[PDB]
C-alpha cells in the first residue's frame with residue numbers, strides 16, 4: 001500500500017468538476033484515508049506545497065491561482081497509489097495529456113489543470129505532512 | 134440563500150457512490166461551504182444527529198449502520214437549498230422514492246439509503262452545529 | 267425477497283441501449299439470478315408471454331416487433347423487486363412515462379418501449395416459467 | 400408527427416451543459432430538423448419570442464439574460480414532440496421542477512433555467528417562424 | 533488561439549451520438565464560434581472538403597456516405613485547438629484509434645468514423661472557408 | 666468478421682460494473698452473438714479456460730477467484746473484434762493498463778481485473794468451444 005496526496009484545484013470548483021474528478025479515482029477503487037476542504041488555502045501553505053518551484057517564472061501566478069477559490073486535499077490509499085493516480089491525472093501540458101486521463105479529457109491549460117497528485121514516495125510523505133500536519 | 138447539512142452515508146462508500154451523489158448536487162449548482170471526512174463518526178454525534186429517533190425501534194440499528202464505515206458531512210449553500218436537496222434526495226421508503234431522485238435511482242433499503250439531508254431551517258442549523266461546531 | 271422477469275426488447279439492441287437499461291437496474295442494487303440471450307425469440311414463447319393481449323388489435327404487431335431482433339430475458343432478485351422495477355420501467359404510454367424512468371428518458375413509442383417487467387407476483391412466476399422452464 | 404422549437408440558453412453555454420441538454424432530447428429519439436447557433440441573438444428576436452411577457456416585471460431582465468451569451472435554436476421533430484419535450488424540460492420554478500427533468504436536475508433559478516421549449520402547436524409554429532424565417 | 537473545423541458525420545446522427553461527441557469537445561473547454569446544421573450537405577461541398585482525396589479509391593464511397601444523412605459543421609476556438617481536437621478525435625483506422633478518444637471509444641470503421649477535424653493551420657483556414665464562406 | 670470470447674468476471678458483479686463493461690463494448694458497435702450467465706462456473710471449465718496457466722503459481726488462486734461469484738460469457742462479433750476488444754480491455758498489470766481502457770479506468774489488481782477477452786484467432790475458437798460447446 002501507498003498513500004498519495006491529491007488536490008482538487010480551484011478550477012474544478014469553478015467548472016463544477018469536483019465530483020467528476022473524485023469519481024474517476026473512486027471508480028479505480030482507491031480509498032479516501034483523509035480529506036479536508038479549504039474555502040481558501042493560506043498562501044503560505046501553497047508556497048510550501050510548491051516550494052520546489054519557487055524560482056520558476058510561473059511561481060507567483062501559480063500561487064495566485066491556487067488561492068483563487070476552494071481546494072479539497074485528499075489522501076488516497078491503495079497498492080502503488082502514487083504512480084497509478086499520476087497516470088490517471090495525465091501530463092501537465094495540454095499538448096501531451098492523453099485522452100482518457102483527467103487532464104486529457106477535461107483540462108485545457110498548463111496551470112488551470114484541475115488536479116495535483118504526488119509524484120513520488122518521497123514527495124507524498126512531504127505533501128501529506130503539509131496538508132495533514 | 135440557505136445552508137443545509139448533508140451526510141454521505143457508509144453504504145455510499147461501500148458501493149462507490151460517493152461522487153455519484155455529490156455530483157448530482159454539484160450539477161444542480163449548489164456550493165460546498167464546509168466539508169469533513171469521518172473514517173468513523175463518533176457514536177455520540179450520530180445519536181445527537183438522530184436524537185428525534187432515539188425511542189424508535191430502529192434507532193440502535195440505525196446508529197450501528199452509521200458507524201459501520203466512513204461518512205462525509207457537507208454543508209451546501211444555495212437559494213432554498215434545504216427543500217431543493219430534500220427533493221433530490223427522495224423518499225425514505227424504497228416503495229415511494231421516485232426515479233430521478235438519489236434514493237429512487239440508487240437506494241434499495243429504508244435504512245441503507247445513501248444520503249441524509251436536513252429537513253427544515255431549524256434542523257439545518259442544529260445539524261450544522263453538531264458536525265461543524 | 268422477490269424475483270421478477272425482465273425482457274430487454276429488440277429496440278434496445280437496435281439503439282444500443284442494452285447496457286444503459288441493465289445498468290439502471292444494476293445501480294438500484296438488483297441482482298441477476300438467471301439470464302438468457304435470444305438471437306430471435308420463438309414466436310410461441312412471445313405469444314404465451316403476451317397471452318393476455320391475444321385478442322387485442324395490436325397483438326400481431328406486438329409479436330412481430332418482439333421477433334424482429336434479439337431479446338435478453340433476465341430474472342432479477344431483490345426486496346420488492348416486482349413493484350420497484352415496474353416503477354423504474356415507467357408507463358407504457360409515452361405521453362405518461364415520467365422523466366427519470368427508463369421509458370420516460372429513452373422510449374418514444376407505445377410499442378417500441380425497450381423493456382418488459384412482470385406486473386405482479388403471479389405473472390412473475392408465470393413469466394419466469396416461460397423463459398426459464 | 401410534430402415540430403417544436405427549443406432554445407439552449409446562455410447559462411447552458413456558461414456552465415458547459417449544451418451537450419448534456421441536447422443529449423437528453425437525443426436519447427428520447429427526437430430528431431433535429433433545423434438548428435442555428437447565435438453568438439448573440441438580436442434583441443428584437445428575443446422580444447418577439449417572449450412577446451407574451453412584454454408587460455411583466457421580469458421582461459427586461461429576461462431579455463438582458465437572453466442576450467448575455469450564445470444561444471442555439473433547434474427545431475425538433477417527433478410524435479407529440481411538443482408535449483413530450485415540455486415534460487423533459489420541467490417546471491419553470493425551481494421549487495417545482497421534478498428530479499429527472501432537465502431543469503429539475505440542472506437548473507437552480509427561475510430565469511437562468513437552461514432551455515426554452517414551445518408550449519403548444521400554435522406557439523411552436525410562431526416560434527419556428529421567428530428563428531427560422 | 534486557433535480555430536478548427538469539425539464535422540459531425542452522418543453516422544453520428546444514425547447512432548444518436550451527436551451530443552456525446554459534442555460533449556467531449558465541450559468538456560475540454562473549447563468554445564463554439566460558428567455552427568451550421570445540414571439536412572444533407574451538397575455533394576459538391578463534400579468533394580471540395582475532401583478534394584485532396586479525389587484520386588483515392590474510396591473517394592466516391594466517401595462522398596456517398598457524407599451525403600447519406602445530416603452533418604453539423606462547427607468552428608471551435610481555443611489555444612492549439614487544431615492539434616488538441618485531432619488528439620481527441622483519434623486515428624482514422626479502428627485498429628489504431630486509442631481507447632479514450634472519440635473514434636477509439638465509439639467508431640468501428642475506417643469510413644464511418646463519426647467526426648472530421650482539420651489537421652493543420654493551413655487546412656483549417658481552407659475548410660472553414662468551405663463550410664463558412 | 667471475427668468472433669471473440671469475453672468473460673465478465675466475478676469482481677464485476679461484486680462491484681456492480683457489469684453494465685459499465687458491457688456498455689463500453691456495445692458503444693464500440695460490437696454485436697452479441699451468444700451469451701450465457703453462470704451463477705457459478707464449474708471449476709473444471711475454469712481450469713480448461715485457463716489451461717495454459719496450469720503451471721503458474723497463481724493458477725489455484727485464479728481458479729478460486731473465478732468461481733467466487735457469477736460470470737457472464739459472451740461471444741462478440743465484428744471486424745477484427747479480437748484485437749479491438751483486447752485494446753479496449755487494457756493490460757493485465759494495473760501499473761500498465763491505460764486510462765481509457767476498461768482495466769485502466771476500473772481495475773486495480775492483476776487478478777481481479779473485471780474482464781477476459783480472447784487474445785488470438787486460435788484461442789478465440791478454443792474458448793468459444795469451451796463456453797459454448
Ligand SMILES: Cc1cn([C@H]2C[C@H](O)[C@@H](COP(=O)(O)OP(=O)(O)O)O2)c(=O)[nH]c1=O
Nearest residue numbers: 053058062091092110111113115116117119
Ligand atoms: C511546468 C509548469 C507548471 N505550472 C504550474 C502548474 C503545475 O500543476 C504546477 C506544478 O508543476 P509540475 O510539478 O511540473 O506539474 P504537475 O502538476 O503535472 O505535477 O506548476 C505552470 O503554471 N506553468 C508551467 O510551465
Ligand SMILES: Cc1cn([C@H]2C[C@H](O)[C@@H](COP(=O)(O)OP(=O)(O)O)O2)c(=O)[nH]c1=O
Nearest residue numbers: 186191195224225243244246248249250252
Ligand atoms: C422511518 C425509518 C427510518 N430509519 C432510519 C433511516 C432514515 O434515514 C433515518 C431517519 O429517518 P427519517 O428522518 O424518517 O428519514 P430521512 O432520512 O428520509 O430524513 O432512520 C429506519 O431504519 N427505519 C425506518 O422505518
Ligand SMILES: Cc1cn([C@H]2C[C@H](O)[C@@H](COP(=O)(O)OP(=O)(O)O)O2)c(=O)[nH]c1=O
Nearest residue numbers: 319324328357358376377379381382383385
Ligand atoms: C396497450 C398497448 C400495448 N402495446 C404493446 C406494448 C406493450 O409493452 C405490450 C404489453 O402491454 P401492457 O401489458 O399494457 O404494457 P407494459 O409493457 O407497460 O406492461 O403491448 C401496444 O403495442 N399498443 C398498445 O396500445
Ligand SMILES: Cc1cn([C@H]2C[C@H](O)[C@@H](COP(=O)(O)OP(=O)(O)O)O2)c(=O)[nH]c1=O
Nearest residue numbers: 452457461490491509510512514515516518
Ligand atoms: C414566470 C417567470 C418567468 N421568467 C422568465 C424565465 C422563463 O423561462 C421565461 C418565460 O416564462 P414562462 O413562459 O412562464 O416559462 P417557461 O420558460 O417554463 O415556458 O420568463 C422570469 O424571469 N421570472 C418569472 O417569474
Ligand SMILES: Cc1cn([C@H]2C[C@H](O)[C@@H](COP(=O)(O)OP(=O)(O)O)O2)c(=O)[nH]c1=O
Nearest residue numbers: 585590594623624642643645647648649651
Ligand atoms: C484512409 C481512408 C480514408 N477514408 C475516408 C474516411 C476518412 O475520414 C476520410 C479522410 O481521410 P483522412 O484524411 O486520411 O482521415 P481523417 O478523417 O482521420 O483525417 O476518408 C476511407 O474511406 N478509407 C480509407 O482507407
Ligand SMILES: Cc1cn([C@H]2C[C@H](O)[C@@H](COP(=O)(O)OP(=O)(O)O)O2)c(=O)[nH]c1=O
Nearest residue numbers: 718723727756757775776778780781782784
Ligand atoms: C500474469 C498474471 C495473471 N494472473 C491471472 C489474471 C489474468 O487475467 C489471468 C490470465 O493471465 P493473462 O492471460 O496473462 O492475462 P489477460 O487476462 O490480460 O489475458 O491470470 C494472475 O493472477 N497473476 C499474474 O501474475
Ligand SMILES: [Mg+2]
Nearest residue numbers: 116117118119
Ligand atoms: Mg508536481
Ligand SMILES: [Mg+2]
Nearest residue numbers: 249250251252
Ligand atoms: Mg430526517
Ligand SMILES: [Mg+2]
Nearest residue numbers: 382383384385
Ligand atoms: Mg404488461
Ligand SMILES: [Mg+2]
Nearest residue numbers: 515516517518
Ligand atoms: Mg413559455
Ligand SMILES: [Mg+2]
Nearest residue numbers: 648649650651
Ligand atoms: Mg483528414
Ligand SMILES: [Mg+2]
Nearest residue numbers: 781782783784
Ligand atoms: Mg489471456
